[PDB]
Design a protein around this ligand. Sequence first.
Ligand SMILES: [Cl-]
Ligand SMILES: [Cl-]
Lengths: 154, 154
Amino acid sequence: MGIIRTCRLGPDQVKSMRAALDLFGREFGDVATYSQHQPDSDYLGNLLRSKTFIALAAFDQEAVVGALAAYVLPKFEQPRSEIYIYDLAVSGEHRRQGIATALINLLKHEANALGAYVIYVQADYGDDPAVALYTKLGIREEVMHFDIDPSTAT
Amino acid sequence: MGIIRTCRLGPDQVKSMRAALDLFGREFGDVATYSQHQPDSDYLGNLLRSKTFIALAAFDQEAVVGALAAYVLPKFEQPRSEIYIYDLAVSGEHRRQGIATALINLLKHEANALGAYVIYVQADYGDDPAVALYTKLGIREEVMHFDIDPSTAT
Ligand SMILES: [Cl-]
Ligand SMILES: [Cl-]
């Protein structure tokens, strides 16, 4: 394996952001969701310009082989911030070489520069790689997640 | 019980937002976290002006008796949005009268006006009221939550 470089994507890197989205679709087995309906370049540029969205990418020979998409939540109860990892994936043939760890490490540096005091993330049962990764790097709690449909508003 | 009115707070309602924060602190048993270190009025005003933060309040005789604090996440894979309920509380003596349901119903209307396709939320085991509420209004999944400390960046 070659040198792996990581960086945070800016609005000048929409093309790499789309490559990261395509990586999510391949590694999550959901190409339609991540590749067939991507936002336009103005929208992705605006998201990448914002201080409350973070996209990190890992590169191998200038191809995206890992990606992490996170939100920064400025809190309402105190002037503090939390970072919420939404999606994280590493290309299958590049797995188990520390690339996800390097992306989370870069996210930690981003957190410290923002002053965010914690990073957190969710994983499903049966997602053994993600569970093993976040158990190594973090403290694990069992919780419940609920999805609510807005279209049934009354 | 009197008439209960609900609304979404704007940047002109910082005082009610602080009352909602104080309500969180009392009902969650954590007054220091929610009342002793609140952000300044510029910060709360900026948060309430933003299109990615939602604070809803329920009132009884013009006192805040329920509050819901949520984030709107514009997604990166598609031009769509999700609403993440962060905190939700109803004053203890006002519980079991549908106030939380009315706040979630108002959040559904806010979601439809934004075009957000889903609302979701997390609850802990042993938080029987929240579990019962979100089981009634939503679909429940068991998942794992991981907290990661940025201060151990390497
Ligand atoms: Cl970014
Ligand atoms: Cl609001």
